[PDB]
Write a protein that binds this ligand. Structure first.
Ligand SMILES: CCCCCCCCCCCCCCCCCC(=O)OC[C@H](COP(=O)([O-])OCC[N+](C)(C)C)OC(=O)CCCCCCCCCCCCCCCCC
Ligand SMILES: CCCCCCCCCCCCCCCCCC(=O)OC[C@H](COP(=O)(O)OCCN)OC(=O)CCCCCCCCCCCCCCCCC
Ligand SMILES: CCCCCCCCCCCCCCCCCC(=O)OC[C@H](COP(=O)(O)OCCN)OC(=O)CCCCCCCCCCCCCCCCC
Ligand SMILES: CCCCCCCCCCCCCCCCCC(=O)OC[C@H](COP(=O)(O)OCCN)OC(=O)CCCCCCCCCCCCCCCCC
Ligand SMILES: CCCCCCCCCCCCCCCCCC(=O)OC[C@H](COP(=O)(O)OCCN)OC(=O)CCCCCCCCCCCCCCCCC
Ligand SMILES: CCCCCCCCCCCCCCCCCC(=O)OC[C@H](COP(=O)(O)OCCN)OC(=O)CCCCCCCCCCCCCCCCC
Ligand SMILES: CCCCCCCCCCCCCCCCCC(=O)OC[C@H](COP(=O)(O)OCCN)OC(=O)CCCCCCCCCCCCCCCCC
Ligand SMILES: Nc1nc2c(ncn2[C@H]2C[C@H](O)[C@@H](COP(=O)(O)OP(=O)(O)OP(=O)(O)O)O2)c(=O)[nH]1
Ligand SMILES: [Mg+2]
Lengths: 54, 459, 70, 320, 48, 99, 53, 98, 345
């Protein structure tokens, strides 16, 4: 329980999840072409959200 | 309350303005005087509560915790002033400042009349114990222990803040007496269940509940002696005090919502007592014993019986005293042999007879020898739990058997047996640490003599 | 007996600019201390011009190979 | 710091205070080759400030009381220990080399501040531009390692191009057997235990890297010992030198102002000498660092800022 | 002379000392005067 | 290797100060710290505080509640009243809902 | 010189006196129901002006 | 006027799309910025002329002034980029990821 | 830079946000934004290294594109309503484009990808000037049109800003990138409280500015750009460790620091407006922010990383770098929680 599975369940799994998420979000290539393509996706998504919300 | 808070505040300029050859003496003496001043809160000749101000009040529950904190501050100074002799003067004064700030904030937390101020002082107490554990701890794992402690407490306490703001928006003031008088019965919806969990999980984390208790053993192992004392003797009781304070506005759905936590408490006290039976580290053993005792306190507060509340208060005070005493004895052995291994030092009864007497008395307090307040709290918790359900006596009996087993196992493997004669560095005894053991044991004797002081709110 | 303090390995686990290396970011280097990167010296591409021999200023039979920057 | 943008606006122009002898002249040579006397006489008869070679205790002599501090405060490196055992396993050689480079950097900053503040020329002995010769000699003799060389090159890249090179570089060419004979005549028992391979590595580093690199940006004044050992012909050549190359020509008032601010902020000067590259020859550790730092702080005159130490006679503390 | 170089704080900056002390005194005096005037104005407005 | 200080060895403190009390290295501060801890901890807190707590009167109305209980028992036994009424509140002043 | 070298011993008693004074200030601040409680509503004795201070 | 204004809005949308969808040429990106500027000027000018807002007629000139300052600073930055790398490649302008 | 161009550039940097805040006209607010961008570019590229050139280029094209979208919104509003202010009946598309472009100028997620990169490669004082001064004018523009904005899009921008800021600050070791992701998270909080109570937006902005300024000053003391570089601060400036720890804990929002107050009052106002799910998610990601702050504290203050040999010479030298305004801002950002009713309105 204590040295294996409670550690595997709450704290180590939380730390593993957040480490994976921060790697996935900070895996940027540093290319402003990709950054502006992402910005275009954001613009399109905002327009779609406004158009469906009305 | 201000007459206790203000000179405890003035302890910090005393610490930073005293001579380096007089700092420990002055701060210890004036903290003893602070505790003597704090003894005036026991003057309760009426059924009323000593509401000193609009933000400070005294209680039959809050008063023993305040007195215990004020009494533990000089004992923490005496315990910690040996492993800081080879230390810088400004770092020593900073450590004393951390202890004094802990005492001030804990007194304010117990005397708070408003739950948002209670939460602010809760986190305010969260800070300097983290600083103490991280900075003056010994091994490498103190950083991981501090992270575990800090973020278990924070992830617990954030929904508590959300719930407190919700209750403040719904009612208007978040004042304890106003809530106690204009309590409204919840309609038992999913929103109210989530509100209940939000306002209880912080205190359950800091108690600690079983399954979420993993921060406690490493924090107590890696902490210095004063940090272990303040943790195991005040902060878990702070969680219990928060549970008692917040449980008044959770009717009626605590009746069925208490079910998983009672089971967690009972089976977790059995499991942690088994860990104490098979544990190779003395401070880990004491920490898991603390987990089991606080599991008993959790079960009593969950079942919400007047006998349970009284037993919870008595077990809080008794366990704080005996756990601080056990940690101080273990720290004396650790400062001797520079190890925390359970089996390394064995025949210490031969070399340290009076310290072996203190060990024996501390363990007899731990296994609830009558007529001590340990047995008073444990017995009344057992009575209330058996009233709640007759089948809880099996879990209680197993826990009592394993409790006596690990306590006497600790005594036999640390004092009895043949002496480890290779330990040439066994200094006889310090009058300071013998005084520390006496200052732990004597209040246990006095509270055993008069148990009416620590009965609490219900009786 | 002595309190543990971070040694070279604990001090070196915080340098590498990513703190959590993976396959897609293990090739990264920490930024320079002065933020001035050592770049490869680009070759100067000077324009080469055949001034003359068919030029009014070249006097008819001069092939002035001119290496010009602008 | 009194000097700043306000003082520059009110008028503290370096180009206003320059003259014909506002030059940086660095004298270079081998281990024992006529270098101390030549720089002294050149500075004395040109009216310039003579800076002797930055030793281990340079910062100790230029800060505080000016007495040489204890060795654990001043670098924890010994030249005599380097001479006795150059390949010692503690890492004394590269610690000594890095400490001497930092001392030379501090001395060069001091000389630049003096020149940009007063206009007086400076005659340095063996500035920062001629310390990699010792580094490369140590490396080619196997006394230090490639990681030490890379760390030195990184620190040199971080620090060297922020300053201006000397106006004149004078070199004394003395052959290795003559250097050995002069070392024997000096009679230092530790300095007598040097190798002709190490001396030849110093000379080869000089002739292969130092002389052309300074030739491309300043005036080079190689002399033999007999052209030297008579510091008047050298002074005449310096007088009839024409400085028509180098980055000193393009400097103006505001470039001089920013350079003066850089060289007067000494922590900014030594900022990159303390990069957190954890090389075992130079990294120390928390316990030893705390012990040395606390001892240095309880040294007299070092507990507070200069002017605030009441134990050494500072007054009017409560009014400042 | 202890230090090899003259410190920037060898002598107290008397202009700064005089200006700071005068500013502190002026601010305290102005604070007391405006507090007394505020008390008097509050009394006059509320008839006390 | 990195220039790290070696491990300090804890000396026998009783070797130079055989009357060591656990508080400080020099004997004078040590003995004064011992006297301050004993005097301000045992003498004036564990004795005067214990006496004060012992002479707190009527603590949470114990003896007052006993005396009032005795008075009510005497009154209700000489007047034929029940010792405890089954309803705490009088039913006349409670308005029950109609249905 | 004892006042100069032992001036640090008055800080905690000064804080205690100041805390008692602040408690008295809070007591005289909270006097909206002085002799107005329905439990303790009694007529004033001729030699007193307040029930408690 | 409404068809013309819709076409001008679509012209701005195309120029913004070009700005957001990079190719290798930073100069082409700056040209897309200038096309966005031109569409904004024409929209403001036809709105002012349609509504007879002579008080708001200085606004398009102010737009041109500040946009030309923007283009000037962009050309200076492109000069610095070309001095660094030899080309104006946004794929060369990438070493700030770490 | 000669003092003439220093005065011109710094005066225009000051004048940009001042014109933006004082301007009634949307066009004058826009030209204030243009002033701020154009004036701050040369000080960004002032060090003339390739990283500074890349940072200046990225910042220029990002702010230019966002300003063009702002100008599109202004011109479309002028077409629809004939005026130069979003009064009450301007189109929701126009308002959403204004919000999106101002969020790209501010640098909050998912428009945040340039901010750690621009903050890297520039000197520390320019990072301070950016992350404090450059956000006031876009926030003023957002505050002027607070009842008109769309709460759904604002809350989505805020929650993704706090999430991405927490994760980025968790990953990075460079101090400038850490401060940039801190800026992203705090901008997320400010945007979250923007449509309900802009007074709390201003309060959080002021608390963030007075917390960010001395942290950048303490970085500016030794040019510590790295976790290790700030970790050996005990040998260089041992007296600053306590204030560093207190300011980082205040940035983490721990009581009883005054940095707990903005998160606390923003959560309170969101609870008053019944956005409990958003408030709880924002609070958990704020806990993640506090985690990377706490790791920074462990590196610099609570433990003691190994030092160098030349740090002895640095201790031989003396410094006058920490200015008079450092300690005032540190104290006002550390110990001001009991004045919370005065800090709020
Ligand atoms: C230490 C344990 C941490 C995890 C467990 C924490 C408690 C779990 C149960 C409560 C839900 C989460 C906290 C909500 C706080 C506010 C509660 C409240 O006000 O309830 C009433 C409110 C309802 O509001 P109301 O009461 O006004 O309802 C209106 C009802 N009518 C209309 C009929 C009048 O509940 C909520 O708003 C709950 C929404 C929660 C959404 C977000 C959940 C995020 C995840 C939570 C856990 C994250 C940490 C752990 C991560 C994993 C670690 C391993
Ligand atoms: C029976 C009851 C069941 C129900 C209750 C369950 C919950 C109980 C309470 C939760 C306790 C969580 C404990 C979290 C702390 C432990 C993790 C940890 O310490 O990770 C350390 C690790 C970094 O380790 P590092 O120091 O870098 O390396 C070691 C040597 N160098 O760290 C990492 O790698 C990353 C750490 C990330 C931060 C962790 C703490 C913040 C978590 C935020 C949670 C957000 C929740 C909402 C998420 C979005 C919605 C789904
Ligand atoms: C760890 C062990 C967890 C399992 C323990 C054994 C099961 C406990 C089940 C339980 O809690 O039952 C009580 C209650 C029964 O339902 P009822 O009283 O009808 O409530 C109406 C709900 N709208 O159930 C409910 O009201 C349903 C919700 C109960 C949630 C309890 C806590 C779950 C764990 C949180 C951590
Ligand atoms: C909310 C907070 C509001 C107040 C914020 C400002 C707090 C006070 C700041 C001014 C201050 O303390 O100035 C002190 C300084 C003393 O000068 P000094 O120490 O001699 O430094 C000169 C260097 N030779 O004084 C000066 O430099 C100028 C003195 C006043 C001149 C008018
Ligand atoms: C309140 C919260 C506390 C939190 C921790 C505080 C720590 C610091 C303490 C500082 C000093 C405060 C002491 C507090 C306890 C005071 C004890 C005391 O004097 O109680 C009063 C009691 C008489 O009171 P009384 O009303 O008669 O008792 C109830 C009967 N109706 O008096 C007596 O009966 C006389 C007591 C003194 C005489 C000596 C008694 C010796 C008893 C020997 C017992 C031996 C067996 C012990 C077995 C232990 C097993 C583990
Ligand atoms: C609409 C949004 C999505 C448009 C996607 C267009 C294709 C694309 O992604 O192009 C990428 C390209 C990148 O630049 P480049 O270096 O030329 O790429 C080499 C290829 N690896 O990007 C470019 O070259 C930039 C292209 C800009 C084009 C602007 C004008 C587009 C006009 C058509 C719009 C789409 C119409 C779709 C109609 C569907 C059917 C009704
Ligand atoms: C309403 C909004 C009020 C303003 C809030 C935003 C802060 C604006 C700061 C403007 C000035 C920025 C600046 O000049 O930064 C560069 C400067 C570098 O400082 P340093 O290099 O130490 O200079 C010492 C030379 N005497 O840095 C500094 O001098 C630091 C300036 C910090 C100012 C903090 C103000 C907090 C709010 C009051
Ligand atoms: N390894 C090493 N030794 C150095 C360095 N700088 C100076 N030294 C040593 C060489 C000599 O033994 C000693 C004194 O240097 P000098 O070149 O001034 O020699 P000295 O004064 O004996 O003779 P001279 O000045 O030539 O007349 O310092 C350095 O960077 N590395
Ligand atoms: Mg010499």
């Amino acid at each position: 329980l204590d040295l294996i599975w409670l550690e595997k369940t709450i704290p180590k799994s939380t730390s593993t999840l957040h480490t994976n998420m921060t790697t996935l979000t900070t895996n940027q290539k540093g290319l402003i072409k990709l950054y502006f393509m992402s910005f275009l996706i954001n613009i399109i998504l905002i327009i779609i959200l406004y158009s469906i919300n009305l | 309350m201000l007459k206790i808070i203000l000179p405890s505040l003035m302890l910090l300029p005393l610490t930073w303005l005293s001579s380096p050859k007089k700092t420990w003496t002055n701060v210890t003496s004036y903290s003893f005087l602070i505790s003597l001043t704090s003894l005036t809160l026991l003057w309760q000749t009426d059924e009323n509560y000593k509401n000193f101000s609009n933000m400070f009040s005294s209680d039959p529950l809050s008063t023993p915790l305040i007195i215990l904190t004020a009494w533990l501050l000089p004992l923490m100074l005496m315990a910690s002033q040996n492993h800081l002799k080879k230390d810088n003067n400004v770092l020593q004064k900073l450590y004393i400042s951390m202890l004094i700030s802990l005492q001030i904030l804990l007194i304010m937390t117990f005397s708070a009349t408003e739950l948002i101020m209670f939460y602010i002082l809760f986190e305010a107490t969260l800070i300097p114990t983290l600083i103490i554990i991280t900075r003056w701890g010994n091994q490498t794992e103190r950083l991981n222990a501090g992270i575990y402690f800090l973020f278990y407490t924070l992830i617990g306490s954030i929904p508590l803040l959300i719930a407190l703001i919700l209750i403040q928006n719904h009612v208007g003031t978040l004042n304890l007496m106003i809530l106690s008088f204009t309590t409204h019965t919840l309609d038992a919806s999913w929103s109210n269940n989530l509100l209940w969990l939000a306002c209880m999980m912080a205190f359950l984390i800091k108690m600690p509940l079983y399954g979420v208790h993993l921060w406690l053993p490493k924090a107590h192992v890696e902490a210095p002696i004063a940090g272990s004392m303040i943790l195991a003797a005040i902060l878990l009781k702070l969680g219990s005090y928060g549970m008692i304070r917040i449980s008044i506005i959770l009717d009626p759905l605590t009746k069925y919502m208490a079910y998983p936590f009672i089971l967690l408490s009972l089976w977790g006290m059995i499991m942690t007592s088994s860990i104490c039976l098979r544990q190779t580290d003395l401070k880990s053993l004491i920490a898991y014993s603390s987990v089991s005792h606080m599991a008993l306190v959790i079960a009593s507060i969950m079942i919400q019986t007047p006998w349970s509340f009284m037993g919870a208060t008595m077990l809080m005070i008794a366990h704080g005293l005996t756990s601080s005493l056990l940690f101080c004895l273990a720290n004396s052995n650790y400062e001797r042999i520079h190890s925390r291994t359970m089996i390394m030092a064995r025949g210490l009864q031969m070399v340290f007879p009076l310290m072996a007497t203190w060990w024996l008395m501390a363990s007899l307090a731990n296994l609830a020898l009558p007529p001590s307040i340990n047995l008073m709290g444990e017995l009344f918790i057992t009575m209330s739990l058996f009233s709640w359900s007759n089948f809880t006596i099996i879990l209680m009996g197993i826990n009592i058997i394993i409790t006596g087993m690990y306590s006497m196992y600790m005594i036999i493997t640390t004092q009895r047996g043949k002496l480890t004669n290779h330990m040439i560095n066994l200094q006889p005894s310090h009058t300071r640490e013998l005084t520390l053991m006496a200052l732990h044991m004597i209040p246990l004797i006095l509270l055993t003599t008069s148990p009416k002081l620590i009965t609490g709110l219900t009786m | 007996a002595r309190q543990w303090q971070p040694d070279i390995e604990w001090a070196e686990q915080f340098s590498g600019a990513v703190m959590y290396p993976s396959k897609e970011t293990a090739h990264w280097k920490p930024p320079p201390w002065n933020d001035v990167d050592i770049l490869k010296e680009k070759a100067v591409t000077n324009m080469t011009l055949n001034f003359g021999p068919q030029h009014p200023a070249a006097h008819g039979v001069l092939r002035l190979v001119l290496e010009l920057s602008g | 710091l009194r000097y700043g943008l306000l003082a520059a606006i009110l008028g503290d122009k370096t180009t206003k205070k320059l003259h014909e002898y506002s030059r940086v002249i660095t004298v270079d040579g081998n281990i024992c080759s006529g270098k101390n006397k030549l720089a002294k006489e050149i500075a004395q008869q040109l009216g310039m400030k003579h800076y002797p070679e930055a030793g281990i205790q340079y910062s100790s002599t230029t800060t505080g009381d000016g007495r040489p501090l204890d060795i654990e405060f001043s670098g924890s490196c010994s030249l005599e220990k380097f001479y006795d055992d150059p390949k010692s396993n503690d890492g004394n050689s590269y610690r000594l080399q890095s400490w001497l480079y930092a001392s030379r950097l501090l001395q060069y900053a001091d000389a630049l501040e003096h020149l940009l503040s007063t206009g007086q020329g400076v005659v340095l002995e063996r500035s920062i531009y001629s310390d990699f010769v010792f580094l490369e000699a140590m490396y080619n003799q196997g006394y230090i390692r490639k990681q030490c060389v890379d760390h030195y090159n990184e620190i040199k890249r971080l620090t060297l191009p922020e300053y201006l090179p000397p106006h004149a570089v004078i070199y004394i060419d003395v052959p290795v057997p003559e250097v050995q004979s002069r070392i024997q005549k000096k009679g230092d028992p530790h300095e007598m235990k040097v190798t002709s391979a190490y001396l030849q590595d110093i000379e080869n580093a000089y002739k292969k890297t130092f002389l052309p690199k300074m030739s491309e940006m300043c005036e080079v004044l190689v002399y033999d010992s007999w052209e030297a050992e008579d510091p008047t012909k050298v002074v005449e050549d310096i007088e009839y030198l024409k400085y028509n190359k180098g980055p000193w020509l393009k400097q103006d008032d505001w470039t001089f102002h920013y350079l003066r601010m850089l060289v007067q902020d000494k922590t900014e000067v030594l900022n990159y000498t303390t990069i957190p590259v954890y090389l075992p020859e130079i990294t120390i550790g928390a316990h030893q660092g705390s012990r040395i730092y606390n001892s240095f702080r309880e040294l007299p005159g070092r507990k507070y800022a200069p002017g605030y130490n009441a134990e050494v006679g500072d007054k009017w503390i409560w009014l400042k | 002379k202890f230090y090899v170089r003259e410190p920037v704080n060898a002598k107290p900056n008397w202009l700064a000392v005089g200006l700071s002390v005068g500013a502190s005194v002026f601010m305290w005096i102005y604070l007391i005067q405006t507090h007394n005037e505020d008390v008097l104005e509050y009394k006059r407005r509320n008839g006390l | 290797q990195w220039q790290e200080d070696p491990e300090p060895e804890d000396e026998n403190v009783y070797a130079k100060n055989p009357d060591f009390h656990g508080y400080d290295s020099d004997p004078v501060v040590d003995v004064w710290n011992m006297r301050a801890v004993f005097f301000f901890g045992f003498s004036i807190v564990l004795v005067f505080g214990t006496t004060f707590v012992a002479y707190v009167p009527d603590y949470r109305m114990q003896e007052w509640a006993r005396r009032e209980a005795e008075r009510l028992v005497k009154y209700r036994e000489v007047n034929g009243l029940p010792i405890m009424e089954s309803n705490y509140f009088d039913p006349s002043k409670i308005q029950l809902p109609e249905d | 010189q004892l006042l100069r070298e032992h001036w640090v011993h008055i800080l905690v008693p000064a804080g205690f006196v100041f805390g008692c004074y602040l408690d008295r200030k809070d007591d005289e601040k909270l006097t909206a129901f002085r002799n107005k409680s329905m439990l303790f509503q009694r007529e004033l004795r001729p030699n007193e002006e307040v029930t408690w201070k | 006027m409404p068809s013309t204004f819709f076409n001008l809005t679509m012209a701005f949308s195309l120029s913004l799309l070009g700005t957001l969808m990079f190719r290798s040429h930073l100069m082409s990106t700056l040209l897309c910025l200038e096309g966005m500027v031109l569409s904004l000027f024409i929209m403001t000018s036809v709105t002012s002329l349609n509504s007879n807002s002579m008080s708001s007629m200085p606004i398009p000139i102010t737009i041109l002034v500040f946009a030309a300052c923007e283009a000037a600073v962009g050309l200076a930055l492109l000069v610095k980029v070309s001095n660094t790398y030899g080309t104006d490649y946004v794929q060369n302008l990438n070493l700030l990821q770490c | 830079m000669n003092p003439i161009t220093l005065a011109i550039i710094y005066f225009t940097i000051f004048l940009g946000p001042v014109i933006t805040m004082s301007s009634t006209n949307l066009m004058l607010m826009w030209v204030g934004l243009e002033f701020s961008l154009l004036a701050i570019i040369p000080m960004l590229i002032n060090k003339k290294n390739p990283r500074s050139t890349e940072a200046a280029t990225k910042y220029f094209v990002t702010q230019a594109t966002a300003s063009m979208i702002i100008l599109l919104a202004i011109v479309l509003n002028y077409k629809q309503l004939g005026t130069w202010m979003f009064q009450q009946q301007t189109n929701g598309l126009i308002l959403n484009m204004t919000l999106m472009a101002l969020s790209m100028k501010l640098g909050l997620a998912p428009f945040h990808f340039w901010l750690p990169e621009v903050t890297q490669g520039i000197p520390l004082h320019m990072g301070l000037i950016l992350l404090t001064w450059q956000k006031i004018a876009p926030l003023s523009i957002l505050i002027q049109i607070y009842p008109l904005l769309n709460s759904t899009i604002i809350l989505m921008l805020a929650i993704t800003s706090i999430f991405m800021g927490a994760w980025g600050g968790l990953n990075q070791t460079q101090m400038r990138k850490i401060m940039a992701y801190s800026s992203i998270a705090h901008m997320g909080w400010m945007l979250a409280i923007l449509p309900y109570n802009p007074s709390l937006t201003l309060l959080n902005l002021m608390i963030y500015i007075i917390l960010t300024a001395p942290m950048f000053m303490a970085l500016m003391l030794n040019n510590s750009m790295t976790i290790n570089s700030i970790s050996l601060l005990w040998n260089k400036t041992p007296a600053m460790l306590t204030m560093i720890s207190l300011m980082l804990l205040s940035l983490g929002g721990l009581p009883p620091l005054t940095g707990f107050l903005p998160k606390w009052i923003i959560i309170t106002e969101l609870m008053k407006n019944n956005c409990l799910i958003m408030a709880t998610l924002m609070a958990m990601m704020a806990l993640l922010n506090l985690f990377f702050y706490t790791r920074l504290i462990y590196s610099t203050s609570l433990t003691m990383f190994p030092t160098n040999n030349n740090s002895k010479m640095m201790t031989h030298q003396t410094k006058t770098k920490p200015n008079l305004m450092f300690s005032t801002l540190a104290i006002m950002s550390t110990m001001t929680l009991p004045l919370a009713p005065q800090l709020i309105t």
